[PDB]
């Protein structure tokens, strides 16, 4: 048996790694399982367009076309259905027209100023597909869903003849007090960091930079004497979102002394060193760092293969 524990701040990608284990090692989500996620996809979609519409009020952004005001009204009249797992053609049309509005887009592109699901664009750009009658979520749709984890999720799978018990816990501040319930008999910790968090603030506190919060947690876990003999794996996750963001959002928002360019390789490396430097015992404790896109099954497959071999060599 191998006990793996996923840790990291909220929305760092822990629960998405869990889903990937089912897809990679257990033949994925069945049709009945996918259908269970349909209301989650619909809920994520409605909540995302609504969050942008709410932000337009706060930031004082007009619709590009005045005709959208009536669509916005109809959005709330019709939203109830999607919350129950149904999306009518009329609702889809309302959301589609809203999503294409230049005012809504302006607000979308300022999402760091409020709280918006990372998968907002993914679902909203695929409205024609997901609004289909008899729509059944794909594996990617399932991977892209967002539900805050409360309590402790335990998943089992077999890989390279090892029986893995993977534990997943909530990362938001309210759930941190529960991490200690998972601390016994841990073979390895996979600590997830959202690379794209560098310019965001906490949903639970708008004065706290998300990445600074991540750093504090990693510092605490990595250097905890309880975990001296526990393999510490660092997933610098959301590399796909990071690659896009680094082009246009300065890393100095997070790290004032960053002197490199607005490019993926230099900035990614700099963030890696910031986290690895928190290790107070560099000669006696190794950190196994990987850059990941948790929603990308192929990337996770190869990364997780490499991680597993490390775990086999070091703990078994
Ligand atoms: N584009 C992209 N999206 C990702 C990536 N990793 C996770 N996500 C998405 O981000 C959202 C949050 O991921 P999730 O797995 O729920 O984080 P969590 O760490 O479990 O969050 P919590 O339970 O502590 S609140 C999900 O919608 C998920 O699909 C990634 O690498 N790239
Ligand atoms: Mg989770």
PDB file of N, CA, C and O in Angstrom, residues 275-305:
ATOM      1  N   UNK A 275       9.782  28.779  -4.435  1.00  0.00           N
ATOM      2  CA  UNK A 275       9.228  27.705  -3.606  1.00  0.00           C
ATOM      3  C   UNK A 275      10.301  26.772  -3.072  1.00  0.00           C
ATOM      4  O   UNK A 275      10.280  26.405  -1.894  1.00  0.00           O
ATOM      5  N   UNK A 276      11.241  26.383  -3.932  1.00  0.00           N
ATOM      6  CA  UNK A 276      12.288  25.469  -3.495  1.00  0.00           C
ATOM      7  C   UNK A 276      13.194  26.101  -2.439  1.00  0.00           C
ATOM      8  O   UNK A 276      13.759  25.391  -1.602  1.00  0.00           O
ATOM      9  N   UNK A 277      13.324  27.429  -2.468  1.00  0.00           N
ATOM     10  CA  UNK A 277      14.176  28.116  -1.496  1.00  0.00           C
ATOM     11  C   UNK A 277      13.582  28.166  -0.094  1.00  0.00           C
ATOM     12  O   UNK A 277      14.284  28.491   0.861  1.00  0.00           O
ATOM     13  N   UNK A 278      12.298  27.842   0.031  1.00  0.00           N
ATOM     14  CA  UNK A 278      11.654  27.775   1.341  1.00  0.00           C
ATOM     15  C   UNK A 278      12.120  26.550   2.134  1.00  0.00           C
ATOM     16  O   UNK A 278      11.923  26.471   3.352  1.00  0.00           O
ATOM     17  N   UNK A 279      12.718  25.593   1.427  1.00  0.00           N
ATOM     18  CA  UNK A 279      13.251  24.386   2.041  1.00  0.00           C
ATOM     19  C   UNK A 279      14.424  24.774   2.937  1.00  0.00           C
ATOM     20  O   UNK A 279      15.433  25.298   2.452  1.00  0.00           O
ATOM     21  N   UNK A 280      14.285  24.548   4.243  1.00  0.00           N
ATOM     22  CA  UNK A 280      15.335  24.940   5.190  1.00  0.00           C
ATOM     23  C   UNK A 280      16.440  23.908   5.305  1.00  0.00           C
ATOM     24  O   UNK A 280      17.441  24.144   5.989  1.00  0.00           O
ATOM     25  N   UNK A 281      16.257  22.750   4.672  1.00  0.00           N
ATOM     26  CA  UNK A 281      17.263  21.687   4.760  1.00  0.00           C
ATOM     27  C   UNK A 281      17.597  21.125   3.375  1.00  0.00           C
ATOM     28  O   UNK A 281      17.355  19.951   3.096  1.00  0.00           O
ATOM     29  N   UNK A 282      18.165  21.979   2.521  1.00  0.00           N
ATOM     30  CA  UNK A 282      18.401  21.640   1.114  1.00  0.00           C
ATOM     31  C   UNK A 282      19.328  20.442   0.890  1.00  0.00           C
ATOM     32  O   UNK A 282      19.246  19.770  -0.148  1.00  0.00           O
ATOM     33  N   UNK A 283      20.214  20.164   1.840  1.00  0.00           N
ATOM     34  CA  UNK A 283      21.126  19.040   1.661  1.00  0.00           C
ATOM     35  C   UNK A 283      20.547  17.707   2.144  1.00  0.00           C
ATOM     36  O   UNK A 283      20.987  16.644   1.713  1.00  0.00           O
ATOM     37  N   UNK A 284      19.563  17.748   3.031  1.00  0.00           N
ATOM     38  CA  UNK A 284      19.032  16.493   3.560  1.00  0.00           C
ATOM     39  C   UNK A 284      17.616  16.184   3.070  1.00  0.00           C
ATOM     40  O   UNK A 284      17.145  15.053   3.203  1.00  0.00           O
ATOM     41  N   UNK A 285      16.936  17.177   2.508  1.00  0.00           N
ATOM     42  CA  UNK A 285      15.560  16.966   2.054  1.00  0.00           C
ATOM     43  C   UNK A 285      15.402  17.410   0.612  1.00  0.00           C
ATOM     44  O   UNK A 285      15.637  18.584   0.274  1.00  0.00           O
ATOM     45  N   UNK A 286      15.011  16.465  -0.233  1.00  0.00           N
ATOM     46  CA  UNK A 286      14.810  16.728  -1.652  1.00  0.00           C
ATOM     47  C   UNK A 286      13.361  17.085  -1.967  1.00  0.00           C
ATOM     48  O   UNK A 286      12.434  16.530  -1.378  1.00  0.00           O
ATOM     49  N   UNK A 287      13.167  18.029  -2.883  1.00  0.00           N
ATOM     50  CA  UNK A 287      11.832  18.324  -3.397  1.00  0.00           C
ATOM     51  C   UNK A 287      11.775  17.884  -4.851  1.00  0.00           C
ATOM     52  O   UNK A 287      12.626  18.279  -5.657  1.00  0.00           O
ATOM     53  N   UNK A 288      10.798  17.046  -5.179  1.00  0.00           N
ATOM     54  CA  UNK A 288      10.626  16.587  -6.549  1.00  0.00           C
ATOM     55  C   UNK A 288       9.598  17.472  -7.257  1.00  0.00           C
ATOM     56  O   UNK A 288       8.389  17.333  -7.071  1.00  0.00           O
ATOM     57  N   UNK A 289      10.089  18.394  -8.072  1.00  0.00           N
ATOM     58  CA  UNK A 289       9.234  19.403  -8.687  1.00  0.00           C
ATOM     59  C   UNK A 289       8.851  19.041 -10.122  1.00  0.00           C
ATOM     60  O   UNK A 289       9.708  18.659 -10.933  1.00  0.00           O
ATOM     61  N   UNK A 290       7.565  19.161 -10.434  1.00  0.00           N
ATOM     62  CA  UNK A 290       7.083  18.969 -11.802  1.00  0.00           C
ATOM     63  C   UNK A 290       6.125  20.089 -12.184  1.00  0.00           C
ATOM     64  O   UNK A 290       5.321  20.555 -11.360  1.00  0.00           O
ATOM     65  N   UNK A 291       6.211  20.514 -13.436  1.00  0.00           N
ATOM     66  CA  UNK A 291       5.274  21.474 -13.981  1.00  0.00           C
ATOM     67  C   UNK A 291       4.145  20.699 -14.652  1.00  0.00           C
ATOM     68  O   UNK A 291       4.394  19.785 -15.439  1.00  0.00           O
ATOM     69  N   UNK A 292       2.904  21.028 -14.304  1.00  0.00           N
ATOM     70  CA  UNK A 292       1.768  20.223 -14.731  1.00  0.00           C
ATOM     71  C   UNK A 292       0.625  21.086 -15.250  1.00  0.00           C
ATOM     72  O   UNK A 292       0.518  22.279 -14.927  1.00  0.00           O
ATOM     73  N   UNK A 293      -0.205  20.476 -16.083  1.00  0.00           N
ATOM     74  CA  UNK A 293      -1.533  21.006 -16.380  1.00  0.00           C
ATOM     75  C   UNK A 293      -2.461  19.892 -15.943  1.00  0.00           C
ATOM     76  O   UNK A 293      -2.569  18.864 -16.620  1.00  0.00           O
ATOM     77  N   UNK A 294      -3.108  20.064 -14.797  1.00  0.00           N
ATOM     78  CA  UNK A 294      -3.867  18.964 -14.211  1.00  0.00           C
ATOM     79  C   UNK A 294      -5.047  18.490 -15.070  1.00  0.00           C
ATOM     80  O   UNK A 294      -5.472  17.340 -14.963  1.00  0.00           O
ATOM     81  N   UNK A 295      -5.583  19.361 -15.917  1.00  0.00           N
ATOM     82  CA  UNK A 295      -6.712  18.964 -16.747  1.00  0.00           C
ATOM     83  C   UNK A 295      -6.247  18.197 -17.998  1.00  0.00           C
ATOM     84  O   UNK A 295      -7.059  17.576 -18.692  1.00  0.00           O
ATOM     85  N   UNK A 296      -4.941  18.221 -18.261  1.00  0.00           N
ATOM     86  CA  UNK A 296      -4.376  17.563 -19.450  1.00  0.00           C
ATOM     87  C   UNK A 296      -3.959  16.131 -19.119  1.00  0.00           C
ATOM     88  O   UNK A 296      -2.909  15.907 -18.517  1.00  0.00           O
ATOM     89  N   UNK A 297      -4.769  15.162 -19.534  1.00  0.00           N
ATOM     90  CA  UNK A 297      -4.538  13.763 -19.180  1.00  0.00           C
ATOM     91  C   UNK A 297      -3.169  13.228 -19.631  1.00  0.00           C
ATOM     92  O   UNK A 297      -2.487  12.522 -18.878  1.00  0.00           O
ATOM     93  N   UNK A 298      -2.760  13.567 -20.848  1.00  0.00           N
ATOM     94  CA  UNK A 298      -1.477  13.096 -21.347  1.00  0.00           C
ATOM     95  C   UNK A 298      -0.335  13.645 -20.489  1.00  0.00           C
ATOM     96  O   UNK A 298       0.609  12.922 -20.158  1.00  0.00           O
ATOM     97  N   UNK A 299      -0.421  14.916 -20.112  1.00  0.00           N
ATOM     98  CA  UNK A 299       0.650  15.508 -19.315  1.00  0.00           C
ATOM     99  C   UNK A 299       0.715  14.861 -17.932  1.00  0.00           C
ATOM    100  O   UNK A 299       1.796  14.522 -17.424  1.00  0.00           O
ATOM    101  N   UNK A 300      -0.456  14.674 -17.330  1.00  0.00           N
ATOM    102  CA  UNK A 300      -0.532  14.056 -16.015  1.00  0.00           C
ATOM    103  C   UNK A 300      -0.067  12.604 -16.073  1.00  0.00           C
ATOM    104  O   UNK A 300       0.641  12.143 -15.174  1.00  0.00           O
ATOM    105  N   UNK A 301      -0.439  11.887 -17.131  1.00  0.00           N
ATOM    106  CA  UNK A 301      -0.008  10.493 -17.257  1.00  0.00           C
ATOM    107  C   UNK A 301       1.515  10.339 -17.186  1.00  0.00           C
ATOM    108  O   UNK A 301       2.038   9.543 -16.389  1.00  0.00           O
ATOM    109  N   UNK A 302       2.220  11.101 -18.018  1.00  0.00           N
ATOM    110  CA  UNK A 302       3.676  11.037 -18.057  1.00  0.00           C
ATOM    111  C   UNK A 302       4.336  11.573 -16.788  1.00  0.00           C
ATOM    112  O   UNK A 302       5.293  10.973 -16.280  1.00  0.00           O
ATOM    113  N   UNK A 303       3.832  12.688 -16.268  1.00  0.00           N
ATOM    114  CA  UNK A 303       4.343  13.204 -15.007  1.00  0.00           C
ATOM    115  C   UNK A 303       4.123  12.182 -13.892  1.00  0.00           C
ATOM    116  O   UNK A 303       5.042  11.888 -13.117  1.00  0.00           O
ATOM    117  N   UNK A 304       2.918  11.619 -13.817  1.00  0.00           N
ATOM    118  CA  UNK A 304       2.602  10.733 -12.701  1.00  0.00           C
ATOM    119  C   UNK A 304       3.399   9.431 -12.786  1.00  0.00           C
ATOM    120  O   UNK A 304       3.711   8.805 -11.764  1.00  0.00           O
ATOM    121  N   UNK A 305       3.716   9.028 -14.013  1.00  0.00           N
ATOM    122  CA  UNK A 305       4.582   7.881 -14.245  1.00  0.00           C
ATOM    123  C   UNK A 305       5.963   8.154 -13.641  1.00  0.00           C
ATOM    124  O   UNK A 305       6.528   7.313 -12.944  1.00  0.00           O
TER     125      UNK A 305
END
